[PDB]
Amino acid sequence: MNTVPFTSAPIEVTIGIDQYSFNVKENQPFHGIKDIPIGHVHVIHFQHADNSSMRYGYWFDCRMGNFYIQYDPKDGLYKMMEERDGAKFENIVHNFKERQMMVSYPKIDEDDTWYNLTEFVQMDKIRKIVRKDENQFSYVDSSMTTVQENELSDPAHSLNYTVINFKSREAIRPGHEMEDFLDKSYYLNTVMLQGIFKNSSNYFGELQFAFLNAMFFGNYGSSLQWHAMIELICSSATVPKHMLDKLDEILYYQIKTLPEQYSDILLNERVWNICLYSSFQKNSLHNTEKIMENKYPELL
Amino acid sequence: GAMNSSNYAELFNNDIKLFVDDTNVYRVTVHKTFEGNVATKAINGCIFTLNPKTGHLFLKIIHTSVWAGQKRLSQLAKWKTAEEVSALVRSLPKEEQPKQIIVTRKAMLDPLEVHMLDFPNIAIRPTELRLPFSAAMSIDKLSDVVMKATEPQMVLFNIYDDWLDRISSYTAFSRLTLLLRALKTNEESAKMILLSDPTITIKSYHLWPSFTDEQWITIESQMRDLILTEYGRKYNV
Numbered sequence: 001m002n003t004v005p006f007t008s009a010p011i012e013v014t015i016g017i018d019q020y021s022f023n024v025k026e027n028q029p030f031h032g033i034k035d036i037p038i039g040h041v042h043v044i045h046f047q048h049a050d051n052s053s054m055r056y057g058y059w060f061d062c063r064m065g066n067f068y069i070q071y072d073p074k075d076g077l078y079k080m081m082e083e084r085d086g087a088k089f090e091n092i093v094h095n096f097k098e099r100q101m102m103v104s105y106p107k108i109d110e111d112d113t114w115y116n117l118t119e120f121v122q123m124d125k126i127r128k129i130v131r132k133d134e135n136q137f138s139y140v141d142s143s144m145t146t147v148q149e150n151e152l153s154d155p156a157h158s159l160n161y162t163v164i165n166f167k168s169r170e171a172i173r174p175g176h177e178m179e180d181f182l183d184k185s186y187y188l189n190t191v192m193l194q195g196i197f198k199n200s201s202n203y204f205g206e207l208q209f210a211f212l213n214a215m216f217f218g219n220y221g222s223s224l225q226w227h228a229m230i231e232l233i234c235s236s237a238t239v240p241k242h243m244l245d246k247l248d249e250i251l252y253y254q255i256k257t258l259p260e261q262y263s264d265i266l267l268n269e270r271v272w273n274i275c276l277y278s279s280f281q282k283n284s285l286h287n288t289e290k291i292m293e294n295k296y297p298e299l300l
Numbered sequence: 301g302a303m304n305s306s307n308y309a310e311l312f313n314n315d316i317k318l319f320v321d322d323t324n325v326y327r328v329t330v331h332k333t334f335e336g337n338v339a340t341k342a343i344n345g346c347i348f349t350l351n352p353k354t355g356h357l358f359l360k361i362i363h364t365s366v367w368a369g370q371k372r373l374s375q376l377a378k379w380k381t382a383e384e385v386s387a388l389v390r391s392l393p394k395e396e397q398p399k400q401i402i403v404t405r406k407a408m409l410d411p412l413e414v415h416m417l418d419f420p421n422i423a424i425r426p427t428e429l430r431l432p433f434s435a436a437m438s439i440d441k442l443s444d445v446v447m448k449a450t451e452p453q454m455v456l457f458n459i460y461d462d463w464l465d466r467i468s469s470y471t472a473f474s475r476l477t478l479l480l481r482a483l484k485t486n487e488e489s490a491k492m493i494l495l496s497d498p499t500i501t502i503k504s505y506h507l508w509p510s511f512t513d514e515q516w517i518t519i520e521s522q523m524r525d526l527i528l529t530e531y532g533r534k535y536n537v
Contacts, residue, residue, distance in 0.1 A: 167410070169417050177414050178379035 002062035003093045003102065004044060005032030006078075007070040012049035013078065016057070016216065018042055018114050019257060020106050031101035032069070032093070038062060040118050041126065044069065045216050046078050055217045056141035061123040064136045068092075080137050116253040117212060120205035129160050129209065140213055146221035159213070159221060162196055162206060164228040166235075183280070185238040192232070200243050203229065204250060211254050214266055227271045234275035234285075244284045251288040255295065263296045273300055303402055303427035311352045312469040317400040318358075320385055321348040321433035322408055324446075325362050326377035342367050346446045347381050348436045349388065351398075353469045355460030360384045361446050361453045382411035388454075389419060398422060404431050431477065438483035438490070441507050461506040466513065475520065479508070482523040485530045493522045 009030040015022050017033050024030045036042060045057025058080035060067050065082045066089040072079050083089040096102055107114075123136075130138035146159040165171060171187045172180045180186055197203040207229045213222035233239055233247060258266060276282060276289050277300075292300065303310070311317065325347055328340035347360040366380060367373050389397050400423045401416075403409060413424050437443045445455050460472045467475075482490040500509045511519055531537065 167413055167417070172414055172417060177383070178376070178411070181410070181414050 001035045002038055003032055003034045003097075004036065004060075004062070005068045005093055005096055005102070006030055007068065010071045010073070014047045014049070016043075016045040017105060019117075022103060029101050030103075031096045031099075032103075033105055034093075034097060034102045035104045035107075036062060037105065037107060037114075040114060041121050041123055043212065043216060044080070048077075054142050056139065057216060058137045058139055059123070059126050059130070060137035064123060067137055080135070080139070082136060113253060113257060116249065117208060117257060119208070119250070120201045121209050121212075122202075122205055125202060125205050126209060129206070131158075131160060132156075140217055140219065142217045142219060144217075144219060144221075146225060148224075149221045159219070159225075161210060161221075161225045162192070164192075164225075164232055166232075183235075183237045184232055185236040188232050188236040189238065200240070200246075204243075204246065208250060208254075215254075215258060215262075218265070223266055223268075227268045230275060231271050231279075234279035234281045237280045239281065239284075244281060248285045248287050251285065252291055255288060255291050260295070263299060267296065267299055269299055276300070301425065303425055303429060305429070308429075309470070311473065314353075315400065316351065316396065316398045317353070317402060318385075318398045319348075319350045319352060319402050319404060319431070319433065320381065320408065320412070321350075321404040321431065321436070322378060322381040323405070323434040324348065324437055325381050326367070326373055342373075344446050344449055345377075346436070346442070347384055348433050349385060350433070350459060352473045355458040355464060355472065357457040357459045358388055359442060359445070359455045359457060360388070361449045361455065363449055363452050366452070378408055378411045379415075381408060382415040385412060386415040386419075389416070389422070400425055402427050404429075404433055432480035432484045435480045435484035435487070438480070438487050439507055441502075457507060459507065461503070461508055475516070478520060478523050478527075482526050485527055489526050490523065493519065493526065 009024045009028055010026070012026040013024055015024055015030075015033075017036070033044070041059055041061050043057050043059050045055060047055045056077065058067075060080065066084075066086065067080055067082055068089075069078050069080055071077070083092075123138075126138050127133070127136075130140060132138065140159070144157055144159055146161050147155075148161065148163045148165070150158060151163075166181070166184070166187075170191060171184065173186060176186070193200060193203060197206070207226060210222045210226040210229065213219045214226055230247075230251070233243065272292065276285060276292060301307075325345045327343045327345045329343065330338055330340055333339050342364040344364055345362040347358075347362065349358040349360065350356070362377075362380065362384075367376075370376055385401065389401075397419070399421070401412065402425045403412060404427060406426045409424055409426055416422055416424060437446065442457070445453075459476060463472045463475065479490070479494075482493075494509060500511060500515065502509050
């Protein structure tokens with residue numbers, strides 16, 4: 001079990017850790033989150049009580065260092081930092097626990113939700129999408145734009161997702177124009193899986209990370225990226241059987257976890273209706289289809 | 301963006317542009333089989349690619365052999381159209397390649413876009429106009445060359461004959477669309493109007509009769525009257 005301590009909570013803010021969240025009052029004595037399960041990535045995110053715009057937060061993995069949170073009154077936001085002094089960091093964590101000023105990561109033992117949402121997400125890949133190599137954790141917020149969005153302005157603050165574009169030379173072999181546009185198998189399997197992602201686990205990891213950023217920060221370009229990578233599989237006639245089955249589990253837990261009241265912006269009607277009912281893979285997403293119908297029959 | 305009544309004069313500026321109409325690309329007859337089922341038989345078709353400023357028409361004849369052994373032929377027809385249009389652009393010198401291609405049916409955007417990926421500066425546009433280019437096979441010389449073809453063939457025509465020696469592009473296109481609109485609404489009457497006077501002939505190198513300026517006025521009025529009559533009949537107005 002690991003701990004992310006907080007120096008203080010000067011401003012009233014809603015704090016999330018993974019899918020859990022707590023309200024903290026201006027200068028309430030809040031001093032960290034303990035019992036954080038080792039072995040998965042995690043995200044700690046913020047929304048100030050005074051600006052319900054700009055949700056923001058930090059992806060991290062506690063195996064990679066000792067990390068803590070501190071409010072910066074100049075830049076006006078809670079900042080993640082690394083403590084390199086191991087002894088000085090256990091000292092702070094132990095004193096805060098003794099005083100019991102830390103919330104416990106509230107995992108129910110029956111629950112694999114977080115594992116299922118993050119199964120393929122690896123901190124090393126996150127830090128290639130969010131390039132900022134002097135920190136071991138990654139900052140993301142509501143307003144960050146993607147590389148593909150920029151092309152159609154500040155690159156230091158860009159989400160470097162893999163660019164997918166169904167009407168590009170990358171996607172379409174000369175002479176197979178109609179074949180490749182109607183059946184994206186060559187783009188999925190040769191260009192993206194074998195070529196760029198190397199394997200399906202890295203592909204699924206970016207997909208899951210894109211979804212989580214859309215859900216937790218309302219990041220619009222992440223939502224676009226998640227839908228694109230879904231559509232690319234569903235629009236391919238030839239997909240490894242192991243990918244289809246894992247995909248149905250991945251999407252199931254994503255749909256299960258979404259806030260009911262956000263289904264309007266986060267879910268793209270055309271993509272899902274095409275994936276579930278028109279695509280090559282209509283018959284291959286039985287659990288995802290069943291949850292979608294029983295929870296959002298309107299969108300369909 | 302889309303072409304409409306507002307931006308209609310753009311068709312006659314000096315930016316090269318082509319209209320593409322795919323309506324006559326895949327043509328069938330429907331008939332009963334011996335066992336009483338329905339079957340189709342394909343006949344020859346054409347792509348109608350037209351420069352509205354100059355009148356130049358690139359009639360690409362689509363021979364029934366294209367379809368042999370293929371499924372989902374109405375979808376394939378769109379990709380074959382786009383394939384052939386792209387090949388036409390590639391065949392033209394750089395300074396003759398269009399800056400825009402306007403498709404008369406929206407289902408053509410994605411096939412042409414994909415076939416034109418090598419030409420990112422050629423803009424593919426839909427249109428909101430209801431252009432009558434499907435009646436191209438009502439023009440006797442075009443129908444004749446399509447139906448006689450024994451292999452894929454491109455035939456070039458000027459669809460304005462020599463009108464541009466005496467009128468502007470704008471007026472020429474308006475005459476062409478009025479003539480085709482009438483042929484579309486009532487082919488038999490439209491054709492009667494054009495040929496009634498046997499002393500007005502069609503030159504061997506032309507598609508339409510050699511009307512004088514005043515005779516064109518009488519013709520155009522007769523085609524307007526045809527079109528309005530058929531409307532009242534269609535709707536009981």
